[model samples]
Target: APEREFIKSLMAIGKRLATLPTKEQKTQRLISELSLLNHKLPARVWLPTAGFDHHVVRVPHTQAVVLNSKDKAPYLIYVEVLECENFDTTSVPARIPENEPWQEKVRRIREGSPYGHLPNWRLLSVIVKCGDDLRQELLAFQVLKQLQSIWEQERVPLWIKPYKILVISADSGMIEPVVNAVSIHQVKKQSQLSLLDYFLQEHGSYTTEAFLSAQRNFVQSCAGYCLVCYLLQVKDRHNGNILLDAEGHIIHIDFGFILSSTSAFKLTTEFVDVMGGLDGDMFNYYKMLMLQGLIAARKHMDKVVQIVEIMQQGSQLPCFHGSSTIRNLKERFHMSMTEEQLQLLVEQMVDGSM
Candidate 1:
């Protein structure tokens, strides 16, 4: 009952976002709509059927911003899903698993907090697009996240947001935004500094405490994304599709282009410079992570291909291709390469990208 209640509340707000007069006037009143938008947002969002137990958290405060892009009316909303007051673990619905104990399941719900590894402010932000099909973005994200999961299973340190996107209809869907991050384009636009200079300005010299930590994050994440980008052939990289997080991780978003087009992974000179050039320790470390993750994922290559094949069979997404594309995917894995050659390959790409 609470679930439908939340759904009803959500649909009402969706109506407000979808229907607009002065797409321009309300565009200016994104924050102004906050007062009117609050009451309809609060509900004990039930997830008993989805993944976790129910009645653990509820949306308290809400904020919305209308995004201006490509003729579509999109709104960015921030929903604070905080833990309910004095939530007794007993209040959470108990579901018995096949083997895992019910209490352990409860622990997963309680301790498995999100957002910056802290539970105090569990902010959930998503881009709600009113007039565009997220199916393209949706289809690509599906496989990219599956790959991301395989990497996690293989214990690779690579990061993939797999930020959730759900299609409400052909021309309406919701997309989750990466946390505490900004696009590289916006960074350059606001600060008027190259990504390299932005890093140096904010974190200081290569050896400094902050810069060192941040640079390590940057290099590790860059390596993670580089390999995924190469394998999937994620394109349209420019700076807009790439994000730099507060932790200095170089995250890639917008998977609208994949399994087609071309990008040898976006490793512009700015990124390399941030890693202290091709010869730097960070670059070397970045290469090592790339190699390890690549090989690990390769170990599970059949599953990866199966994922793509099934999705291709199921969805008519334009990005999908048949045998030729599958062959291209297989080739990217370089099934014949030895360990030494792979390392050399990483070195070459890093250098060539520069």
Candidate 2:
């Protein structure tokens, strides 16, 4: 009954806001209305950043209580209001004056230029596609989360933070944000610092020990995410979609292309270079993590296949079209291969990545 009541209240607010004239007024009204539903709902919510469209909001907490205090207490959630009648097929365009296009402005903002303003924010958020394709995206994330679960169960020496997704209706949904993180593009644009340098400066770590501690976590997470990306055949592996968190973990966002369905690139091995070039101790650590995760995943091949098969029944994603999805997935498992063979395969893949 409370859920129904909340929905009713939300619809009423939506109707009321539709009558507003100015964008500023509508934003103010939306914030006021969302604040009223704070306690009634689960999280503390607010509008998106200044430049973002009105459809997006940031929710700092999803549940009533903290599950792990040591972990980020407030699990940041990004809620996108889905409008079914008029859907946007393209990426959100840059907000700027007509005379000063993004390309022109960006060129001036490059290194050694007069325009020195660097981005203080990040775009490390998950996008849960809504409307007709809602079920497909939801199912995809669910399967990936299950894969991560398998690795966790096998006690893999790495962590993959599977974002939470909720479909409120056929028209709206919410997703988890990569907490205290910034995209690699933002990191590069803001300053020409490497991952290690950026963390050192951001964290104000004067000592070598502090940098080293952060470096370890950074290397481990990068390795884990890369392996997951490879196994899933995630495409569009660029700096804009990869994020580095304050906790020194590399996070991958945006799953629009999966199962080797990308027209642009076939694999996401490009992440190797992004993780501080191709050679070094960090790279070695990354390779080791990938090998470990692959070995662990192979151990539970049947469970993994069963999970994917179950989700496939309900999947409406174009990427999962035809019967080849399962076949391709099965091929990746290399079920008949011995431990040594699997290790070699993984090693070769890692080597080729560099």
Candidate 3:
């Protein structure tokens, strides 16, 4: 009953915001109106810990909270603020990353910060899904978090913001509060073609150019992200899970079934190499284009080396050890260098993997 009431309130708010023209405006209108639902009850729900404590917020799925001095604005909000009553029980393990201290620093800014001298407003907490698959939910959050961190460190000269991941314990599974980014499926329908079909039609003979210039942003973003997910042993990179933002940016959502390394590269049950069947040049072009770009980034390669060196030394469990993908990568690069050099290659490949 509480969940139903929450959904009704959310729908009412959506209807009100539908009158707005700009998407930004609609988002703002909905966010600003969330103050009406503060202190709401039956607002959270509990699920099995699926190796991580996860709860989905039932209503006001997306609320706004002020988080920092630099991020103090009426519309801007820091995300995934946790409001769990208990996260240490057997349901969700307490094995949070050592980055908890850093996360707290961020939390302080969100909870108590001035946005344009106005209190920063955070959007309502909304869980992306509500099934009993807690592992998938946790995977989604972890993958998003990892993507955010990776972008922060690597994607310089090309700035992008990875979406935030949050966990709530609520009964409702309303979709209103999830960030409304674009997806390949959205583009496919808009253009009336499958993703591969769309690319083939649009790029024709010079599809690799699309991979570099027009579509490079998405390719690198998704491929690099996939590489990381593969390392984490994540699965479930189905077509719908990858999204494109309204700004034509690529965003990966739905990590409910990832972070397991065993079958990251397993082709689909009914895999087809139609591109190769249709045009043999496609493979050559794709490989060459990637190789050319990767080789051109020798300077960035130096930085990648530094990252891998650090990871290798600090990691108690080898994220890279015995990985066939990484092994193939090493062989492909003819990687015969010092720890630093080898690290750079791995880092560059990993960064470029998504």
Candidate 4:
């Protein structure tokens, strides 16, 4: 019932836009119109249904923005709307092949450098259901919570605002109008999409080296995300689900198929290994992290030991438990290892585990 009303409101807005004189004029008018609609729907009750309100433009298209609301300030409390008309059902799978124009659209809007200025601009956010059999929304909430925590703790360079995860209804028809509701900056001649679209379309692959000076930043950003996913035991991290912004920052947009229950801490190792492909400077960054992890391990080993002890104490005698690697590590490093020892140990843990 709520979704229906929201769709009706959006349809009305679209009708009003059809009356505009020019595409540019239509977009300006649409932004103001949606701004008014945004006020009508209070932030608290806003459902993640298909529609345009404020600067948001949600579409069923495979690739879309997962925006941060950091710069949005007072508007942070507003609504996030997503429209999923092209979802895969029995006939078509949920995943779609890369559409060149849509890909270009994402690049144009993102690289247009409209983060703080464009009224139609919003930070990127994606919606994903856990799996086909398990359609529970709580899992979606859990995934979002963990991602937010990871981004905050790692101090990852990219700017990501708070985001919402919504489940698509099974019976809803296609909702393409939602994408048409907002005017992209390029459509208004304000700016062009980043070189990202070119990379994706022409090469069918994206690499940090494609953009000069953006290599290290991209690696760190991606490694930070993968570390969290690894720590959480998130699986199915294919190339299709991840997104790249204008400055070459990595953003994880899909979480529909993933495996949970892995060690999040082990990610530090992966971060170092993956970042190794870069030049010496990136290696230095990883080295610094290795040093930091060792220091933290030395000082906080007690905490790790205590946790293992507690787990052991609380479990029944017959409790099936996995081996405690961190606990073993605490024992091995109990006597305060030298910097050389620490570096060797860190390297062994990462490389040897593989």
Supply candidate 3's per-residue lDDT for 281: 54
For each candidate in turn, the TM-score is 0.71, 0.61, 0.38, 0.38
Question: Which stretches of candidate 1 lie above 4 Å from their native place?
Answer: 1-26, 29-62, 80-123, 149-156, 261-264
- Tens digits of per-residue lDDT for model 1 on 197-292? 888888887568888888888877887778877887777777767888877887787676777524446577887788788667777788888888
lDDT of 3: 0.39
Poorest lDDT segment (10 consecutive residues) of candidate 3 = 66-75
Total clashing pairs for each candidate: 0, 0, 43, 16
Model 1 scores worst on lDDT over the 10 consecutive residues at 93-102
Look at candidate 3 and tell me the lDDT of residue 229: 50
Per-residue lDDT over 257-284 for candidate 3, one digit per residue giving the tens place of the 0 to 100 score = 4322232433221111323431355333
lDDT of 4 by residue, 100-186 (tens): 344555555455432323344443332222112222222433544544444445543323222343434421111111221222223
Better of 1 and 2 by TM-score: 1
TM-score comparison, 2 vs 3, better candidate? 2
In angstroms, give how far residue 216 of model 2 lies from its true place: 1.7
- Residue 44 deviation, candidate 3, in Å? 15
Tell me which of candidates 2 and 4 scores higher on lDDT. Answer: 2
Q: Which one wins on lDDT?
A: 1
Score candidate 4 by lDDT: 0.38
